[PDB]
Amino acid sequence: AKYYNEPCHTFNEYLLIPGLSTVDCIPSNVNLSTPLVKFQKGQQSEINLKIPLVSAIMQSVSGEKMAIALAREGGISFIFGSQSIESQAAMVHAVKNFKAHNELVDSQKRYLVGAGINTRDFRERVPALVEAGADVLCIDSSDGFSEWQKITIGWIREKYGDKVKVGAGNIVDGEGFRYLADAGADFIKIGIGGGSICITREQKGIGRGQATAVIDVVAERNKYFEETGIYIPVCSDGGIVYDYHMTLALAMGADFIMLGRYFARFEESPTRKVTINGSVMKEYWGEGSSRARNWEGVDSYVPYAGKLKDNVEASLNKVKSTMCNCGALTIPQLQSKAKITLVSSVSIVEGGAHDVI
Amino acid sequence: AKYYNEPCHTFNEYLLIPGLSTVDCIPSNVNLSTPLVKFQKGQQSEINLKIPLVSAIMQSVSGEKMAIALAREGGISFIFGSQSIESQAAMVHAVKNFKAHNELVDSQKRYLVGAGINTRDFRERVPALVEAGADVLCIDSSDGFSEWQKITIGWIREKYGDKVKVGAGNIVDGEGFRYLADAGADFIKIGIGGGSICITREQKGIGRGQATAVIDVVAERNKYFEETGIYIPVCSDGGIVYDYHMTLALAMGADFIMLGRYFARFEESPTRKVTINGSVMKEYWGEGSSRARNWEGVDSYVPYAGKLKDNVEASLNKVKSTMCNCGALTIPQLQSKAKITLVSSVSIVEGGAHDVI
Amino acid sequence: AKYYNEPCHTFNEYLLIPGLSTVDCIPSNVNLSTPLVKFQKGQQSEINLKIPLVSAIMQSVSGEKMAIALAREGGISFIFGSQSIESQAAMVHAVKNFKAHNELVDSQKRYLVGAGINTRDFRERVPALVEAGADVLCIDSSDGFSEWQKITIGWIREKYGDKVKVGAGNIVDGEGFRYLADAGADFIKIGIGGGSICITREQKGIGRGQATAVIDVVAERNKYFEETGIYIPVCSDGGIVYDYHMTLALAMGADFIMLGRYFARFEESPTRKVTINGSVMKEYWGEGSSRARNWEGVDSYVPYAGKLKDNVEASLNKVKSTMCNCGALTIPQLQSKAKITLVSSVSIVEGGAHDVI
Amino acid sequence: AKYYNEPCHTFNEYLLIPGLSTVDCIPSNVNLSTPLVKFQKGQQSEINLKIPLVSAIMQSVSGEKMAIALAREGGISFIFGSQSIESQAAMVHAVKNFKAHNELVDSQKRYLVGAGINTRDFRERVPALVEAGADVLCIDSSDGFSEWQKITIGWIREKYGDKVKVGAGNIVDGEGFRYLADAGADFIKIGIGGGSICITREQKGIGRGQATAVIDVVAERNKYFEETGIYIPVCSDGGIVYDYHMTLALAMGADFIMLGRYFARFEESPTRKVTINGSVMKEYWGEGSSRARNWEGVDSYVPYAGKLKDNVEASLNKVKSTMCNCGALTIPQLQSKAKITLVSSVSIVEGGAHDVI
Numbered sequence A, B, C, D: 001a002k003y004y005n006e007p008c009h010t011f012n013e014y015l016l017i018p019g020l021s022t023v024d025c026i027p028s029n030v031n032l033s034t035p036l037v038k039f040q041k042g043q044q045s046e047i048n049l050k051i052p053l054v055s056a057i058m059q060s061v062s063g064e065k066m067a068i069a070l071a072r073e074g075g076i077s078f079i080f081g082s083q084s085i086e087s088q089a090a091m092v093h094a095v096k097n098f099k100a101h102n103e104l105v106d107s108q109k110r111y112l113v114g115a116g117i118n119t120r121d122f123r124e125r126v127p128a129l130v131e132a133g134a135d136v137l138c139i140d141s142s143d144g145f146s147e148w149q150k151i152t153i154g155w156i157r158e159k160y161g162d163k164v165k166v167g168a169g170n171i172v173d174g175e176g177f178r179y180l181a182d183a184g185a186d187f188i189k190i191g192i193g194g195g196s197i198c199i200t201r202e203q204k205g206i207g208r209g210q211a212t213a214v215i216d217v218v219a220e221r222n223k224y225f226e227e228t229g230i231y232i233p234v235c236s237d238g239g240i241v242y243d244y245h246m247t248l249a250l251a252m253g254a255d256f257i258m259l260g261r262y263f264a265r266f267e268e269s270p271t272r273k274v275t276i277n278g279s280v281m282k283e284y285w286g287e288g289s290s291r292a293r294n295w296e297g298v299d300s301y302v303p304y305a306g307k308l309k310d311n312v313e314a315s316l317n318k319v320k321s322t323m324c325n326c327g328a329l330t331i332p333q334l335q336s337k338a339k340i341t342l343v344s345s346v347s348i349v350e351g352g353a354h355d356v357i
């Protein structure tokens, strides 16, 4: 077997060390634009998010309401594919024809929307999603290091060339990244085991600390870019617990972030808002739960947070403020200048409130 | 004294990183056969289990019912030797003559069964077990790095040559492995302190993290094979808490796994099924407890799990699925291709369900 | 991004190993004097504290009463600047004209006092503080690695030359130290995230273990001194939980220590003494709490400790005793001779009371 | 300041890995004799304990009854010196004249006994203890790296030559050992902060993990022996929680072990046996508690264990059994052959009972 020199680490084990903050860096001047799909050296991506957040490919997260609400703020949603082809295409169509500052739209001013696909019924599902107006697709899987994803991407390329964009994943190391890169993926998703509703141990025991996974994949992605001139955006998927984890993921090299729990708490998520003992909650279940995969996972509740807009603004304002502490006005600048330290196992306590009531 | 460069680690500190999964790897095509006794380069073992699981040499685990139930699924039980010679031989005889898909049997279609022996009354116990029809024997001890085991194996070789198979142990490092290998053991058992009912600290303070023990012994076993052309199967004994620990043990190099608690929960274990406050439990005590060694250990209860068959199928289906994630269709292929990472002390939390009710 | 070879550590992870204690080292012979502002090689600081403790620039800590009480014992307070310019100058004036063994005073025998300033209204606030009689100033910020601090110090130098002393901060590494050193700071404050009422994670995720921060900054400060002949005193700000942490901070190289919670517990702090369920407490809130910054932080209570005098004497007696264990009669000697070890993550338990009721 | 490459570790972080156990190693053949005072290469110590245990220099542990009970089993007690010179000499006299298999006695068949002394009144206390018949003395201090101990030992040598034996300590590193070795100590005590009733953090913050301290001192002691031909026995004082910690301390190089809590639980300790809510306890307080030092520490209770004899036999039987697992028939052989591993921070759980009720 193959072993590694260091153990893997998660986002909670890292902190950012400030860099020189100049007079021109104030939160309002920070640009959070980021590429969504691959491009060549010297070019710009054909699709750029206005904010680095995308909603998870989950029944309890990315419905039509979510897709519209997020696109309005500059991000994009990936309508879940764990439903009939007709039902998914209907949601995509509804988002693209909803209009019949930071909004993410196409040349026709329609909100952009993505859709998840599987390695099984893609020959029928992909055409339907394309006709419905899907702007980008993404193969939804816990282990993207599979010949099945290569086959799926291959079929798409042979039928649509590079006109149809498709992300692939998930992978957690350089080898997995390279395999999907060579396969033709437009963006690669990183993360196995980090999800809030994913209990690795009680399952297959496959995974890797999210921080280590991102750092490793990003190194391989940068090596790949230098070798081929092709820049492939990567997505840190899962493991975001606190707002600063967003800043860390981006600083470590991720172009954008995929979140489930974070968005499930909003009014726009497709789940039911239920009031339990005085506390308004929202349902949240993983795609691996029996409650979903049958149309491996856990079913739960998340505290109601209200409308997406206000929460995203608050989260990103903190990200922007932190970026200025690090001397960065853009994500690429943050990825270049960030100083990231690991924190001791025997600590973390000093970081939070201590010795006070 | 002699010290080591790194601290020892247990199974809970590791995770598997996926490899390339090909279209031909589906759980149903995975072969879990594995060698039980030593053989020379170019040969196959005289005894191959159909599944890599064997039941512990314990009064509360391996009785005749267990031996039949496990052999039926492809594994083998080691009838406890902590009973009279006549009583143990009777159980072996009963299993071998019970018949008077994955079943593990001899050339006469009779279920295979093993039996534990001690370094004290072997001159009388071994002959009885052989006559009763025992297919394999195993010296039962917490510290197999003993001249007593060499003497026992020597007596068996001098009286039966290589016709009677005998495992030895337990050891936790290369030196212990080599000593028993040179002594003539047919397979060597690994593990001291990892058992669920073994409290190292409150005892002698001897032991080693199970993962480190397996990894070290396997390295020595492979070195031994290259030097002598002799391949000696090794058994990871104890420390299995979750199904994925099985996959890890095998990936680290163990040919098969010995479990106590896992099997004690089944209907076929020889202990009493007792109902406590609405919960059906099964008794489970270690061989070191006063309740047993007198015909150092703890006496306890384990949740009733039902029939062995359904539980083993579920566990192994998960192992097979994980093997496919790692690109392995067989155990030897898994041992060659597995990518195994240690996880941070400051983590493991991200791995399970978090920040959700 | 830039990474580090080792994770950061906090004070609780360290212990001091005794050195040779001579017959002349008794607590009463220990000198705790220390420089407050920069000077050149061969010179002495223009301001030397008689004890290495200064009170935090906080509304709930450094009022006029605190400043007088601390100066009387040899330390200095930094009157909070989170109030009107007129109100702050009034407190400074009151301390300087209060008289109208270890007392810290000027050439006119008046108690010394400091005052915090911000990078916004300094053109008006600084002149007022100078006229009021402020002996030293200090820019109050969580991230001192800013062009704003360079501008502020520059304005002060251009208007007052080196006659007005001004500390800057906070920083946590060599780069931040060097930036403020070159900018002209008279002393540099170290620490981000360590404060008792600062919850890093629930904020920006910026910071560094206090011990590592001090050690790193001190190394850079010593390198700077060797290069330029300029010695810049540094202050360890925040993270002090136990008295021995004071000894550690000083041993690691800090010239003095800034504390908030420690002083808030005293009768002289400007907060209200409230009795809760039989326990007398004192209010304590961070400068980042809404309760303060509006004239990011937490509001709380700290156990009443009584008068400052008796508590400081007790704390420093322990520091002096420990210094003698280390063979040091002065702080510089402690910084040169201290033997400091990190303690295992798997321990710390042996250090406290254990296995006894 | 001086730093170290590795953090310090405690006994709970280590486990012993078995070595070859021969047929001649059974508990009853294990010899636990060990030297108490220094000797030259090729010689034997003038005083050899029959068991490697000595009772702490504490009011709540080593009284006349304890000294007699322990000497009867082969160990020695150090009558506390935190009492009047007359009172301490009386206890020593009573033990030496009490008679007016493994018993530790002098040439006159009288039980051996030790006595603690301080660096203050030794000019009067030492003569009294010598006349009373003390067999060995030991300077009692938390930080033995002091000129005061050198002076004390010097006075003893000048007045009695090498006829009066005197141990010194405590120290935790090679430098401290060497200082006391050159000063003339007959044996050196190791340990600061490990005591069960010693709360390092709430005090001076001085100390070192006991395991690391012993290992380091032993290395220096062996280097010293090779340089001068003088072998100085060392004592591991404090930190023993479990019986196996005894085996570890000895395996790491300590010639004998000093314990407080362990002995306080016995009928022979001088404290009161009190019954609390159905549980018989014994009082136990440190020498640093106000309750003692006035004729820094904690006052507590320890579960009654009964007579010393039966408990010591049980503890040492386990030590002997473990020694045989390691292939050692004597302490020196154990120190030469022991294989000692550190255990992961993320573990230790596997070592104890787990996943069972």
Ligand SMILES: NC(=O)c1ncn([C@@H]2O[C@H](COP(=O)(O)O)[C@@H](O)[C@H]2O)n1
Pocket (backbone or CB within 6 Å): A056, A057, A058, A191, A194, A195, A196, A197, A198, A199, A237, A238, A239, A240, A258, A259, A260, A261, A262, A285, A286, A287, A288, A289, A296, A297, A298
């Ligand atoms: N285990 C499951 O049932 C399940 N369902 C979704 N997921 C993963 O978790 C991610 C969401 O993580 P989180 O809630 O944001 O921490 C998804 O984008 C996906 O990669 N896991």
Ligand SMILES: NC(=O)c1ncn([C@@H]2O[C@H](COP(=O)(O)O)[C@@H](O)[C@H]2O)n1
Pocket (backbone or CB within 6 Å): B056, B057, B058, B191, B194, B195, B196, B197, B198, B199, B237, B238, B239, B240, B258, B259, B260, B261, B262, B285, B286, B287, B288, B289, B296, B297, B298
């Ligand atoms: N300490 C005891 O009393 C005792 N009895 C059995 N054992 C060990 O524990 C193993 C079972 O571990 P577990 O229950 O499967 O974790 C046995 O195969 C044996 O090696 N230990």
Ligand SMILES: NC(=O)c1ncn([C@@H]2O[C@H](COP(=O)(O)O)[C@@H](O)[C@H]2O)n1
Pocket (backbone or CB within 6 Å): C056, C057, C058, C191, C194, C195, C196, C197, C198, C199, C237, C238, C239, C240, C258, C259, C260, C261, C262, C285, C286, C287, C288, C289, C296, C297, C298
């Ligand atoms: N986060 C806040 O609201 C806040 N207010 C003050 N502080 C920091 O905490 C320090 C006090 O730390 P402590 O209470 O002594 O641990 C201050 O000197 C300052 O650097 N932080």
Ligand SMILES: NC(=O)c1ncn([C@@H]2O[C@H](COP(=O)(O)O)[C@@H](O)[C@H]2O)n1
Pocket (backbone or CB within 6 Å): D056, D057, D058, D191, D194, D195, D196, D197, D198, D199, D237, D238, D239, D240, D258, D259, D260, D261, D262, D285, D286, D287, D288, D289, D296, D297, D298
């Ligand atoms: N801190 C105290 O008040 C005190 N009193 C005794 N001690 C130390 O603790 C040792 C006993 O440790 P323990 O109880 O056996 O863990 C003593 O031999 C001594 O070195 N410490």
Ligand SMILES: [K+]
Pocket (backbone or CB within 6 Å): A018, A019, A020, A021, A324, A325, A326, A327, C143, C144, C145, C146
């Ligand atoms: K900055």
Ligand SMILES: [K+]
Pocket (backbone or CB within 6 Å): A143, A144, A145, A146, B018, B019, B020, B021, B324, B325, B326, B327
């Ligand atoms: K795979």
Ligand SMILES: [K+]
Pocket (backbone or CB within 6 Å): C018, C019, C020, C021, C324, C325, C326, C327, D143, D144, D145, D146
């Ligand atoms: K000392």
Ligand SMILES: [K+]
Pocket (backbone or CB within 6 Å): B143, B144, B145, B146, D018, D019, D020, D021, D324, D325, D326, D327
């Ligand atoms: K052995």
Ligand code: NA
Pocket (backbone or CB within 6 Å): A349, A350, A351, A352, A353, A354, C193, C194, C195, C196, C197, C198, C199, C200
């Ligand atoms: Na904090």
Ligand code: NA
Pocket (backbone or CB within 6 Å): A193, A194, A195, A196, A197, A198, A199, A200, B349, B350, B351, B352, B353, B354
């Ligand atoms: Na998880």
Ligand code: NA
Pocket (backbone or CB within 6 Å): C349, C350, C351, C352, C353, C354, D193, D194, D195, D196, D197, D198, D199, D200
């Ligand atoms: Na302690």
Ligand code: NA
Pocket (backbone or CB within 6 Å): B193, B194, B195, B196, B197, B198, B199, B200, D349, D350, D351, D352, D353, D354
């Ligand atoms: Na165990």
